Amino acid sequence: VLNFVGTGTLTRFFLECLKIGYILSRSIDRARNLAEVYGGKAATLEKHPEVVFVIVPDRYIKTVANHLNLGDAVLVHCSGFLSSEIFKKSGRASIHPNFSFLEKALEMKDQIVFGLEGDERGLPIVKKIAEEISGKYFVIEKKKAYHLAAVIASNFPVALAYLSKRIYTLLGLDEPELLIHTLMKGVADNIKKMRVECSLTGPVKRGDWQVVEEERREYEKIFGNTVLYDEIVKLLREVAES
Amino acid sequence: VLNFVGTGTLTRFFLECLKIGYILSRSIDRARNLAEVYGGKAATLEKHPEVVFVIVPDRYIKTVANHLNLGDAVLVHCSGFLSSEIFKKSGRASIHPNFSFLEKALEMKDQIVFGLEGDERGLPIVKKIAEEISGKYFVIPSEKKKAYHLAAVIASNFPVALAYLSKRIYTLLGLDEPELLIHTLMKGVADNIKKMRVECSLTGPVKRGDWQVVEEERREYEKIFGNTVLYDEIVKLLREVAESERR
Numbered sequence A: 001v002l003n004f005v006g007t008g009t010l011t012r013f014f015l016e017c018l019k020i021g022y023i024l025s026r027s028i029d030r031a032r033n034l035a036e037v038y039g040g041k042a043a044t045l046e047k048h049p050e051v052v053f054v055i056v057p058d059r060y061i062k063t064v065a066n067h068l069n070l071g072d073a074v075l076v077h078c079s080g081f082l083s084s085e086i087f088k089k090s091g092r093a094s095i096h097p098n099f100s101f102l103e104k105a106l107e108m109k110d111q112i113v114f115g116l117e118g119d120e121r122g123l124p125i126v127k128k129i130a131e132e133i134s135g136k137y138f139v140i141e142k143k144k145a146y147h148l149a150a151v152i153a154s155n156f157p158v159a160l161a162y163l164s165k166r167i168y169t170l171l172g173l174d175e176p177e178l179l180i181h182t183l184m185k186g187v188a189d190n191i192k193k194m195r196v197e198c199s200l201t202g203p204v205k206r207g208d209w210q211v212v213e214e215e216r217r218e219y220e221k222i223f224g225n226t227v228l229y230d231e232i233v234k235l236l237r238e239v240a241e242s
Numbered sequence B: 001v002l003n004f005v006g007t008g009t010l011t012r013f014f015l016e017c018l019k020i021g022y023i024l025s026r027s028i029d030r031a032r033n034l035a036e037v038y039g040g041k042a043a044t045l046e047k048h049p050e051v052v053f054v055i056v057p058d059r060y061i062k063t064v065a066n067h068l069n070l071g072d073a074v075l076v077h078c079s080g081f082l083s084s085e086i087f088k089k090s091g092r093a094s095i096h097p098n099f100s101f102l103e104k105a106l107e108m109k110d111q112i113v114f115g116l117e118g119d120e121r122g123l124p125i126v127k128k129i130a131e132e133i134s135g136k137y138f139v140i141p142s143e144k145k146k147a148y149h150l151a152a153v154i155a156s157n158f159p160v161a162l163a164y165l166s167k168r169i170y171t172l173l174g175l176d177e178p179e180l181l182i183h184t185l186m187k188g189v190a191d192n193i194k195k196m197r198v199e200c201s202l203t204g205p206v207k208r209g210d211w212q213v214v215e216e217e218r219r220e221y222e223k224i225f226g227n228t229v230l231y232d233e234i235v236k237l238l239r240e241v242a243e244s245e246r247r
């Protein structure tokens, strides 16, 4: 009897899949709104439930839980940085969906891998839930590193797309999104088809150090320094030299 | 009135979608083959052409173009870095397709934004061509092509350094095929950026303001790679991508 305590895409993802007890949000308006598309109820000043998904910001997850504290259920959350051991109680689990949530694009779930960890009653639950949406998952103490990897893989890339957007913007291209995507999408796919070490191309890849150097000045001129740039090049060589 | 130099995968492109007079190559056969499939002649000890697409490695465009010597013909290369101006002649231009050339994947032809930059009278020649192949493009001054290329690098190459960092830590955790996992994580962001503004695609902990993780994840990062240089930089920017929205 899946209970979700967050009103905002992700529970929407799970709802749409595992289509249910209650759906809570700090304002029934949104709670209702959702439980009227998949079916359930409402209120963060709700009834007594008993599995519960606390899909709210990390820094809250713990608190929000130790505040509803009712009816024998199985505590779970989607944070890949924190364990279930935060709840500090019976049947605790953690199901992390390595993906970024456009709720439409996440409808290609069968590709999503899950980071699972729990206890007696908990683990098997998220394993089944995990199994019910995609093919498999992974079990994690290494929570930190495992999650860091998801951030420097689905978060950090925006910092590049952003950087590229700024300079294109300044260059007159009014709507660069379409261009930036084409390139970034390519790299993504190419990162697959070719494992990382064989996926590289560009200036550094082939020498052309006069291009890397001249673009360092061009990087500095557009922004205020060359730190990130020098960092990515030092990285790229590490890649390139494989 | 198109003559091409360099039987590269990229010329087979403009040829195919533009059905020509003289296709030069170092090999007479190689030129003769594309002429057989499209229509032209050959040799770099050629006849005397007169527009000339010099589609060869960025490394020889100038030299080669100075070993072509022919009369009345606007010159154009497709270098993403180099400028038309490298030709130092009255009728020049530069057409750059942001795409990587499988030959037929180029059936994606409709969605190739072009980076043009040409002469006064050399510009409308390339401007006309992009309009055909795919009506998406934009002119850029010759004194800004280095900026332009820089951009492509950030969106093209740079991500790789991110794929590298993660694969490294997924393997530290003994993950089967990390690239898959990586591709999933990254493509979700790669595509989303098409249906929305770059800055509307950031979803992580910085976004939520979960500094508590941003901070520990940085010590975890230091622990794994020796420093926090790259980590600090992106985080600074992401916290910047997230505030822009606060408006």
Ligand SMILES: NC(=O)C1=CN([C@@H]2O[C@H](COP(=O)(O)OP(=O)(O)OC[C@H]3O[C@@H](n4cnc5c(N)ncnc54)[C@H](OP(=O)(O)O)[C@@H]3O)[C@@H](O)[C@H]2O)C=CC1
Residues within 6 Å of the ligand: A005, A006, A007, A008, A009, A010, A024, A025, A026, A027, A030, A055, A056, A057, A058, A060, A061, A064, A077, A078, A079, A080, A081, A096, A097, A098, A099, A100, A101, B203, B204, B205, B208
């Ligand atoms: N974005 C990502 O990159 C991914 C995040 N996750 C995990 O998902 C969880 C949340 O992710 P995310 O999508 O950012 O969520 P959002 O920040 O969009 O979540 C909004 C939801 O959190 C609730 N909320 C906001 N502030 C508070 C508060 N002060 N107290 C209680 N509830 C609050 C909202 O309340 P209300 O409905 O009342 O408005 C709403 O239900 C985390 O555990 C995260 O680690 C998993 C995969 C990916």
Ligand SMILES: NC(=O)C1=CN([C@@H]2O[C@H](COP(=O)(O)OP(=O)(O)OC[C@H]3O[C@@H](n4cnc5c(N)ncnc54)[C@H](OP(=O)(O)O)[C@@H]3O)[C@@H](O)[C@H]2O)C=CC1
Residues within 6 Å of the ligand: B005, B006, B007, B008, B009, B010, B024, B025, B026, B027, B030, B054, B055, B056, B057, B058, B060, B061, B064, B077, B078, B079, B080, B081, B096, B097, B098, B099, B100, B101
């Ligand atoms: N590859 C891509 O995805 C893209 C390339 N471009 C631009 O297109 C141009 C060519 O790019 P690229 O794909 O590397 O090309 P290729 O290496 O595929 O080009 C091969 C062609 O270049 C000729 N060539 C190679 N070396 C020499 C030389 N030393 N002297 C004379 N001719 C030579 C070949 O000789 P021969 O004729 O004898 O067979 C052949 O015709 C560049 O200006 C590049 O910046 C732009 C966008 C994308």
